[PDB]
Design a protein around this ligand. Structure first.
Ligand SMILES: Cc1cc2nc3c(=O)[nH]c(=O)nc-3n(C[C@H](O)[C@H](O)[C@H](O)COP(=O)(O)OP(=O)(O)OC[C@H]3O[C@@H](n4cnc5c(N)ncnc54)[C@H](O)[C@@H]3O)c2cc1C
Ligand SMILES: Cc1cc2nc3c(=O)[nH]c(=O)nc-3n(C[C@H](O)[C@H](O)[C@H](O)COP(=O)(O)OP(=O)(O)OC[C@H]3O[C@@H](n4cnc5c(N)ncnc54)[C@H](O)[C@@H]3O)c2cc1C
Ligand SMILES: [Cl-]
Lengths: 263, 338
């Protein structure tokens, strides 16, 4: 079984904080990481590899420093890594990004299973995986809570707001991943093997991808402006009395006075 | 590369009718409310798009809630949402009738459908948007949060059509139904039938007969790792019963076996906006906060005075939830009756 995992390097936006006092964005502890949902997409793939034998290829599209997330992928067991790196891909919206990735995948041969994260925590669109599926003409299931393989079929657990579901589809297919176990550890030996590996770097011309379907050129949308949102500070009234009955009487009296609890 | 480029003759704003038990889910009405305003700004019509096994009396409900036009495509295959069936139907209608913009509620299934349609048509799609505006010519201005809510972006789809976006639920207000409204129902016949490649082998309702789901509860009584044991969630069920709310939990609570996934609040779960969110033994990770930070009031019950959840809580107690909960429930019950 051949698997491709689409992996994005992102700033760790979970470390960003807007200070409600100044309304400024604080970026203490923000570094580039492997997108968390992609970590789950990878771990899903590696679990399939361990169970069934599967060859796992990770692909990322980014600047040259994105190569580090590919090294991390190899360090935990992925077989092969490819870096798609060219200023011609820069400024891409989700359509242009998914075109680039679809055409990269098709170049090397569509695999049995493509795994993407549910979303990237920077853009937060959740659009690339489905758009890839459409570009390649493949069925999808998004936001997987569990993925299994039975023969030539993929079995995916997925919920919506009303229903808990399980779906099957035949390979080749695309799955986007909401949860797996946390990605496994990379040992020193793993990280050394990854460091020695050859990671090819592919330009648009090498992959024969037309310039006009990638990057800004291929993007129907454009970000015209960005800004930090207003956060209104909350001055909470917190009771910390040793006797819980006293804390509860104080809280409840205040909830009643402030019309939060009624009847 | 000319696929999806504007003709110039596109017109009208379309709202996707997501439905459950035949009936529109509430975000459909939220979108009709906001998109009525946008349609009026550009002197175009507002349409609702209904892909269903049985239209029932839904079209008239959509018109009473703002729609000028309702496009109905009816087939038994549409009973339940599916990517393949619904993308085909919607794209056939876009091709036939040429809307200027399309708005999809950013529900779980809407976030699946939207990008499939956008890629098939080859147009622009803005995600999970929270502010919308329109020029007189019908160009939509899409404003959305990104970077975990730390950045806002304003985005245009200038030259491709339809201009698409998914739109965050529980952001915009529905109109009151108006039985004096009139509109036109257009029955659309599918040109090509498809075979759905994805088979549903299990489809179970997450909430039982006449019980309260967290998705719409006016009070959410939520537990995390600090609830200590599954059996202690009884304390939150008691609280929820006293108030007429529902019980939720964190992703840590799911992982420890305390609650099932459909009760998970946060970016990977449900986003709730109750009148009161009680956060009990929940630290306030950013990933949990993403699902509840727009609750009207947050009450935090935590042993750690430095828990991040206190930062956004108007009220709270520093103490042991397991001691606090039963006393709070009893006091509330006594205030209520009588
Ligand atoms: C503030 C801001 C707002 C934006 N809003 C929009 C918007 O509303 N619409 C829009 O079309 N674009 C938008 N963009 C552009 C968008 O972030 C990029 O197009 C990005 O390449 C893909 O979208 P995403 O980050 O939302 O990823 P998602 O679509 O959430 O990514 C989903 C999955 O696709 C795969 N994937 C995505 N990118 C890569 C990559 N580079 N290499 C490998 N795999 C990848 C990963 O498996 C990932 O988990 C925005 C950008 C900014 C900075
Ligand atoms: C990609 C991604 C997606 C995620 N999605 C989600 C999501 O959708 N939702 C979500 O919840 N998490 C999500 N998380 C996880 C999140 O990072 C946290 O691990 C999680 O929210 C912590 O849950 P918790 O607060 O219950 O546990 P903890 O952080 O362990 O906090 C337990 C708290 O209980 C308190 N406590 C202990 N004993 C008592 C007692 N007797 N009484 C009162 N308080 C007590 C403690 O002081 C502490 O504050 C996600 C993480 C990632 C990376
Ligand atoms: Cl297809």
């Amino acid at each position: 079984m051949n698997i491709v995992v689409c992996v994005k390097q992102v700033p760790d936006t979970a470390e960003m904080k807007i200070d409600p006092v100044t309304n400024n964005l604080v970026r203490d502890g923000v570094t580039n990481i492997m997108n968390p949902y992609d970590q789950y997409a990878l771990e899903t793939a590696l679990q399939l590899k361990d169970e069934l034998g599967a060859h796992v290829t990770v692909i990322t599209m980014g600047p040259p420093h994105a190569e580090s997330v590919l090294r991390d992928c190899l360090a935990v067991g992925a077989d092969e890594a490819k870096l798609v790196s060219d200023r011609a891909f820069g400024g891409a919206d989700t359509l242009a990004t998914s075109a680039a990735m679809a055409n990269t995948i098709k170049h090397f041969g569509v695999p049995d299973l493509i795994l993407c994260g549910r979303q990237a925590i920077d853009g937060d669109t959740a659009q690339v995986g489905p758009e890839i599926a459409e570009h390649l003409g493949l069925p999808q299931v998004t936001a997987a809570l569990k993925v299994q393989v039975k023969d030539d079929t993929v079995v995916v657990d997925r919920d919506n707001e009303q229903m808990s579901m399980t779906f099957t589809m035949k390979m080749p297919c695309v799955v986007t991943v909401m949860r797996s176990k946390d990605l496994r550890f990379a040992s020193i030996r793993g990280k050394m093997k990854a460091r020695k590996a050859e990671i090819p770097v592919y330009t648009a011309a090498a992959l024969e991808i037309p310039l006009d379907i990638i990057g800004k050129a291929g993007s129907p949308t454009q970000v015209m402006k960005s800004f930090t949102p207003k956060v209104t500070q909350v001055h909470g009234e917190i009771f910390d009395d040793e006797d819980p009955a006293v804390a509860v009487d104080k809280l409840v009296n205040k909830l009643i006075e402030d019309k939060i609890i009624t009847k | 590369n000319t696929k999806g480029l504007k003709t110039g003759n596109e017109k009208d704003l379309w709202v996707y009718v997501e439905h459950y038990k035949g009936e529109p889910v509430h975000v459909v009405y939220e979108l009709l409310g906001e998109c009525r305003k946008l349609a009026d700004k550009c002197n175009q019509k507002l349409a609702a798009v209904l892909i269903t096994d049985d239209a029932k009396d839904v079209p008239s409900k959509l018109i009473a809630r703002g729609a000028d036009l309702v496009y109905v495509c009816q087939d038994p295959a549409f009973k339940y949402y599916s990517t393949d069936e619904y993308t085909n139907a919607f794209c056939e209608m876009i091709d036939e009738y040429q809307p200027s913009s399309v708005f999809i509620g950013a529900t779980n299934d809407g976030r699946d459908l939207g990008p499939r349609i956008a890629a098939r048509v080859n147009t622009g799609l803005c995600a999970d948007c929270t502010i919308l505006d329109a020029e007189e010519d019908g160009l939509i201005e899409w404003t959305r949060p990104a970077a975990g809510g730390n950045i806002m972006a304003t985005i245009l789809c200038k030259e491709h059509r339809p201009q698409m976006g998914t739109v965050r639920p529980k952001t915009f207000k529905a109109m009151e139904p108006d039985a004096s409204r009139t509109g036109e129902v257009i029955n659309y016949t599918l040109k090509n039938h498809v075979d759905d490649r994805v088979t549903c082998i299990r489809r179970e309702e997450v909430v039982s007969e006449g019980e309260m789901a967290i998705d719409d509860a006016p009070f959410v009584c939520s537990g995390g790792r600090g609830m200590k044991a599954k059996e202690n969630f009884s304390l939150l069920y008691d609280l929820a019963h006293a108030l007429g709310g529902a019980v939720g939990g964190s992703r840590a609570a799911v992982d420890e076996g305390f609650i099932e996934h459909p009760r998970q609040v946060g970016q990977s779960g449900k986003t709730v906006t109750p009148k009161i969110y009680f956060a009990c033994g929940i630290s306030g990770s950013v990933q949990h906060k993403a699902g509840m930070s727009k609750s009207d009031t947050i009450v935090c019950i935590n042993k750690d005075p430095d828990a991040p959840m206190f930062e956004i809580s108007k009220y709270g107690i520093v103490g042991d939830a397991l001691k606090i909960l039963p006393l709070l429930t009893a006091k509330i019950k006594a205030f209520k009756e009588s």
